[PDB]
Amino acid sequence: KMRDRLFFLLSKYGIRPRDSIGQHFLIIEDVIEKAIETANVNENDVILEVGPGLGFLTDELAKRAKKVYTIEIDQKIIEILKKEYSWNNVKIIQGDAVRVEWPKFNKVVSNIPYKISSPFTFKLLKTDFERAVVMYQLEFALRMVAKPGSRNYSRLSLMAQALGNVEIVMKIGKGAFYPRPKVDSALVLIEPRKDKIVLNENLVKALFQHRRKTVPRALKDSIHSKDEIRGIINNVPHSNKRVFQLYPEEVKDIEEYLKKHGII
Numbered sequence: 001k002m003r004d005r006l007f008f009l010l011s012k013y014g015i016r017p018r019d020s021i022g023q024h025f026l027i028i029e030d031v032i033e034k035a036i037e038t039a040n041v042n043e044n045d046v047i048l049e050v051g052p053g054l055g056f057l058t059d060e061l062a063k064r065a066k067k068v069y070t071i072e073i074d075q076k077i078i079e080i081l082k083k084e085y086s087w088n089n090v091k092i093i094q095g096d097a098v099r100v101e102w103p104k105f106n107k108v109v110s111n112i113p114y115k116i117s118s119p120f121t122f123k124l125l126k127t128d129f130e131r132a133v134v135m136y137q138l139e140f141a142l143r144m145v146a147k148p149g150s151r152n153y154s155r156l157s158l159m160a161q162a163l164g165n166v167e168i169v170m171k172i173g174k175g176a177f178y179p180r181p182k183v184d185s186a187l188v189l190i191e192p193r194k195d196k197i198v199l200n201e202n203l204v205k206a207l208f209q210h211r212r213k214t215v216p217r218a219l220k221d222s223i224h225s226k227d228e229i230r231g232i233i234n235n236v237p238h239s240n241k242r243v244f245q246l247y248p249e250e251v252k253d254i255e256e257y258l259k260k261h262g263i264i
C-alpha cells in the first residue's frame, strides 16, 4: 500500500526520478517505523529531514513532531509536496542541504542522498543536536561505524565517534526503494556523548593523510611546522600505534601534547 501509493503519485504528477540527485524513493513502511522508533520522536521535537521525496517519512514526522524543516533540492518535488500534503507544521526549504543555512533543531530523521553523505555528516557533527537517525548508502554507514584498527577506519569514523555513539540499527536492501538502486542502505543512530571529544581538524587531516603510518612518522611527514622539531616527536604519546589504530581519546592526547610544546 506504500508501493501502490508511490505508483499512484508517479502517474498522477508525472514524476521523472533523477538519479543525479539520488532519487530512490522509500517504499517499505517498516523502515519508516524503525527510524521514527529509534529517534523516539515526540510532540516537543523539532526535526530536520533532508530530501523529503514523496514525503512519506515527512508525513510521519509531521504528525508526531512539533515542527519539521525539510530541505529539497528539486523544485518540482516541492510543488508536489505542497499540493499533496497539508502540513501546518512543516516548513519546506528550497536548496542544497549542504549550501543553505540550517534552522535550529534537536533531532535529525532523514535519508541522506549519496552525493552529500560526507559534507552533510561533517556539517551535522559541527552542530548542537540531541539525536540523529539518518539512512546512508551501506559502504558509508560501515565507514562511520568502523572501529579503530580496521582498514575502513578514517577521519569520518574518528570525527563521528568523537561526538557520539554511532551504531547501525538496520540494513535496508535495495528492494526497499524505487527506482531500485545499485546499493544497499543502512539506518544509523547517532547519540551525542556527554563526554564530547573535540579535536583540531587540521591535525586530524594531517594524521589521516597517510593513516596506515605510525603516529611519529605521520607527524614527521605532515609539517603544515618548521621540520626542526625532531626533539618532540620521540616523546609523542601513542607512538607504537598507527593512525588508523587511534581512538578520539588518544588523538586528543596527541593534540594536548603538541599544544604543550607550542606546535599548535
Ligand SMILES: Nc1ncnc2c1ncn2[C@@H]1O[C@H](CSCC[C@H](N)C(=O)O)[C@@H](O)[C@H]1O
Pocket: 021, 022, 023, 024, 025, 026, 050, 051, 052, 053, 054, 055, 056, 057, 071, 072, 073, 074, 077, 095, 096, 097, 098, 110, 111, 113, 116
Ligand atoms: N543536495 C540535496 N539537498 C536536498 N535534497 C536533495 C539533495 N540531493 C537530493 N535531494 C532530494 O533528496 C531526496 C532523496 S531520494 C527520496 C528520499 C526518500 N523518499 C525519503 O525517505 O525521504 C529526493 O527528493 C531528492 O530530490
Ligand SMILES: NC(=[NH2+])NCCC[C@H](N)C(=O)O
Pocket: 165, 167, 191
Ligand atoms: N546497541 C546500542 N543501542 N547500544 C548503545 C546505546 C544506544 C541506545 N539506543 C541509547 O539511546 O543510548
Ligand SMILES: O=S([O-])[O-]
Pocket: 015, 016, 017, 018, 074, 075, 076, 077
Ligand atoms: O524529478 S524532480 O524534478 O520531480
Ligand SMILES: [Zn+2]
Pocket: 033, 034, 037
Ligand atoms: Zn516497530
Ligand SMILES: [Zn+2]
Pocket: 237, 238, 239, 241, 250
Ligand atoms: Zn597508547
